[PDB]
Amino acid sequence: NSELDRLSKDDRNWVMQTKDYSATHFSRLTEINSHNVKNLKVAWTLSTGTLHGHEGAPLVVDGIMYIHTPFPNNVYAVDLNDTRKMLWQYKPKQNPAARAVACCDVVNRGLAYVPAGEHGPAKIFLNQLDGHIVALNAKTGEEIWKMENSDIAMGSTLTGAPFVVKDKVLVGSAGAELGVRGYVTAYNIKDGKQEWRAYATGPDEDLLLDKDFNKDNPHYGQFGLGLSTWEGDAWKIGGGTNWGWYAYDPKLDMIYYGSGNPAPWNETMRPGDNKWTMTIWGRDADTGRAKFGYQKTPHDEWDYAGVNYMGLSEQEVDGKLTPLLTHPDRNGLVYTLNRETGALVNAFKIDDTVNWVKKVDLKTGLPIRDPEYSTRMDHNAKGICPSAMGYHNQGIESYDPDKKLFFMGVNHICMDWEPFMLPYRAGQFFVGATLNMYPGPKGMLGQVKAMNAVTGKMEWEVPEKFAVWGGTLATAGDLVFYGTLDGFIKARDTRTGELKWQFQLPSGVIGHPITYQHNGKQYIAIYSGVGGWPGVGLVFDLKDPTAGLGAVGAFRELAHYTQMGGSVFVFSL
Amino acid sequence: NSELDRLSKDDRNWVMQTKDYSATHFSRLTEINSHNVKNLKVAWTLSTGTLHGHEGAPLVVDGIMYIHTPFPNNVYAVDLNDTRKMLWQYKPKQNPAARAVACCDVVNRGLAYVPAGEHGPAKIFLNQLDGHIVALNAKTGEEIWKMENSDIAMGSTLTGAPFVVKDKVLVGSAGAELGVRGYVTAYNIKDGKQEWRAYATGPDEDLLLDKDFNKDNPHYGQFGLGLSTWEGDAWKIGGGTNWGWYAYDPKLDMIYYGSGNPAPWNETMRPGDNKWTMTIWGRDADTGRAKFGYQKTPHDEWDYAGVNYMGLSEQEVDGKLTPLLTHPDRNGLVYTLNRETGALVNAFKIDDTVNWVKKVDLKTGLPIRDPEYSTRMDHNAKGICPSAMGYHNQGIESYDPDKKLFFMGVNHICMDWEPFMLPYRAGQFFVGATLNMYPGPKGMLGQVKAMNAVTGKMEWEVPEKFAVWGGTLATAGDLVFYGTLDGFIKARDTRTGELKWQFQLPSGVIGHPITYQHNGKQYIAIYSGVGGWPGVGLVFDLKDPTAGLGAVGAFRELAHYTQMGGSVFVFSL
Amino acid sequence: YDGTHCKAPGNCWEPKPGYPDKVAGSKYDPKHDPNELNKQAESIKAMEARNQKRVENYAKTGKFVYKVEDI
Amino acid sequence: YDGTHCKAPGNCWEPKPGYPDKVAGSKYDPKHDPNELNKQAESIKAMEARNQKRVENYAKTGKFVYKVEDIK
Ligand SMILES: O=C(O)c1cc(C(=O)O)c2c(n1)C(=O)C(=O)c1cc(C(=O)O)[nH]c1-2
């Protein structure tokens, strides 16, 4: 959507969760910098009126902030000239049973927006937990249309944010822990009419492939693999949901995103490479046809769900300027690909302690597995790095084009893992593994790192008490902002990683900060309201260290620092 | 408790909800003042982990802040040298049914504290919604003892803060809307052993009267009136619960507090003065025996529950310095009495629009009624001022001894009222009246006022969009601080009422601000989390204007500004 | 009824125009059930009795116990 | 199983030492009910049918209606 793209270049706006189509999460605003950020103070705050995990972040379009909420996913609009008053609201009626088929808290990653409009007036888009994609009037809050995407009876929900491209809105999927077979769907913004729908497993027509699929990298594999990498009809419940983020290149007219983990977690119950789970996709916008697809983790054994964000950039590869995508996976590897051909440019460990793979052979594209850290029936694998939470999760990260550095919030969590046999029944959980999680070899749970994605050169690395979950925001003031699970927002110098400012929020942060300028002054905003997977112990009052899919034990001390909350904080000089 | 009294008198502590035994809510601290409050900023915040209304405010003793919470009334202790970490916690297990028998949101008005002495370690006291009084170790949060005060099966709960005097802790009562006969109880703090219990109605032995009860004003009434001002056994279920605040004069060894409204609201069902509901009590500390008792609202017809705070001061009455209590009742009158003899000194309207009463006759102490604004069966009374929410409610107000001025948050609400017949059933509501509320003759719902309690002279008056519900804090910096229902904390100049400062909190405020010095620096703290009676509409999602005991209608617009929340905000320079 | 005419000190109630002196047997008879009226008093007796066992136990053993069946 | 030995492009899975090539009829036969496997896709077709009913109604009348039993 060219008009949406143009709107994102206005520093008054923050028009999508990823800030822009390249998902840079970078602002050129320099009013707030390393030199004065010590003087940063709270300007105003809003309560969301709910608890549990608050992921994503507000949108700002036309001097109007848009706020979303975990289940039941309430939506509020605020006039930035009257921050106390609620301009409009939308309060969904959803079957509360939806709560029961969410693996890792009832989080929701936020609103999308499209301007007017041959389709016509500007619209806010919301994915509800109960599986609906809803279109609202951006100005009035009136419900324009509402469609069924996912069925909670099948254990299928929505948590990932909708994504606007041209006159279409893409809706992902969730529930691989309940054996949901992944699929992404494009709806016409005017009608709600389904245009195309691509699955992550099965026959080639369901995958929605182009005739030239992976013609530039035929060793990635091409046709029939959605079937032939499974035994029998195993693919019908074979995971590959996509509940993460998208990227878009208008010149190439291509959408980028990753598909999730195979089902179940019990690898012995699904022999084969399990394509096309764990795959980096490059699909044509209008038809949804995949031009390339690269499987990062063939035959997943660790729940390294390949859904993390897609950061586009243009950098030199052997002296040649190249359109790229950079993508830090759960498996602990940072992938950089040519976003035109899908060619592997680099794949390096985000942290050297990653041990499920020795290295990725860039020529064959294959990750060389270390059998010592595999998983299998009748065995309890110990000391696997990363754990199922990964060395990186759902946080959107940031890119400074002048430094050519990606700034990321990192997890340092490892695990024990043993599978067990289980049946599949539509509507029931279909995990099939018992986990125990704990800090990685360096003793800490969190890190923040700055890196060149082409070389893998770490410019700096710092520790954090807990995993940095919510992503980052970088600015031309030489600062990177992020929230922590124990309830801080922090600013570090992007050259050195030095801490330059921090404020104690009410609750932990699992979303990203945003920035915008309103009436000539720069602002920083963030959600405070801990939850998500690291907070399942705290949120649902769990005791057993292997509960919450193994997360409870790892994050036992989190509740020593933070309760649940739900608020929007806004800072300024 | 002489030690508790002393602690209340250095400004590093906030040892009781009322700050000190005279409920001055006045601080000598001047670091923050009218000339620099412009620069006040947020220092740090905490999330409470719950929603619904947050009444009362934290305590600060010996470098520790103590936090409390609406149902299930969680308690947290926080070291002021480490504001991110929670020192200890107490998470009560209560019967969820307790929610069902709370009239006006599941609020709780706070912790009390006693120092170590002979009983012996220092203790934190908590009243739970489910009718338990609990004693906690102030340093470790360990449960020391726990007693049953009130039975929720009878519609009897607890919402008022415990009150420590000498080696006893006072526990009130709640549930007059459910036909609960009021009683206050003194427990020994070492043991939890009941020392005495005084009822608000019935035989004189149950009322705990001294042999010289009202000897200074026998025209108030004396003996037998707890029975003879009722018809038959109607006193057995006749209200008078006390869920408000207390005051204490160590020199006279007397406790002061007001008993609440009679039941039912249907006045026709309970002919008689209904003593001793609606009464200013002066009781002996050790024995609980009343020296005086003045009924403010004989035969209540409006639910003017007489439980509001008592503020002790010493001012000249006709040239002679006199020990006083000042008391802004729900009925819209401000009572000032001699706190030794119980003699009535003055009783002026807090706003001239009060119409249920023409005037109080100071020599007889009787309120001369205006029949035009009475209530009665088979009549719908229109335009009564104040409404049942009163021109003043549960907020603890403040007193500047230098200026001889009280500073109060005021309500400007009026009502329609028709009663209806209904049976009494233990465990069921026992209200029997339909109400509709609206703003008073002046278009506003709220006010802030400064007044001389002896003369009645208004110093200044300013409007407020909503009722000012949470009380006030005044300081020697010439500032009065308060919170608003639409979600602000505000500071005004005490000499003029000029607005000096304002910050947008996440959610509305129904408790008071506190201030304290920690490590040489002055802080301001307050709860943010709307609820209580004014918030019942948005909290429980009601639409019918007469629902929420007639609050929903008048406060329909409240949700336009604020959602529920739950957090502590701390400000500093 | 203006609140000023008093049978006795502290007792000034009067019926309103058209209303009775006593509601017993009138149109506005509350007709209270004696058994329901007694339930608060009995409930309170039980609470005080359980509390007493908690105190006597606590004084005797030096260790507090809330549940009376464990005492 | 190091992931390197590929029977075809994109197909490099091998069983681990001591584990079967096919799980059918083995220790670890998942033994899935075909009827349970097919429920996801059956549910999606139902949704797409209700969705198309909502679209065509929105197109003809110009007023959106979610409840299909209220659609002519
Ligand atoms: O397979 C799935 O469908 C699915 C869904 C979700 C979700 O809905 O948030 C998560 C995951 N997987 C997952 O693997 C994971 O680690 C995770 C973390 C979170 C969170 O709240 O931060 N969601 C999810």
Ligand SMILES: O=C(O)c1cc(C(=O)O)c2c(n1)C(=O)C(=O)c1cc(C(=O)O)[nH]c1-2
């Ligand atoms: O007589 C009673 O038992 C009783 C209890 C309470 C309560 O529990 O807070 C209130 C009242 N009455 C009352 O009359 C009233 O206006 C009121 C306001 C509030 C509040 O939290 O805002 N509670 C109560």
Ligand SMILES: [Ca+2]
């Ligand atoms: Ca997953």
Ligand SMILES: [Ca+2]
């Ligand atoms: Ca009441």
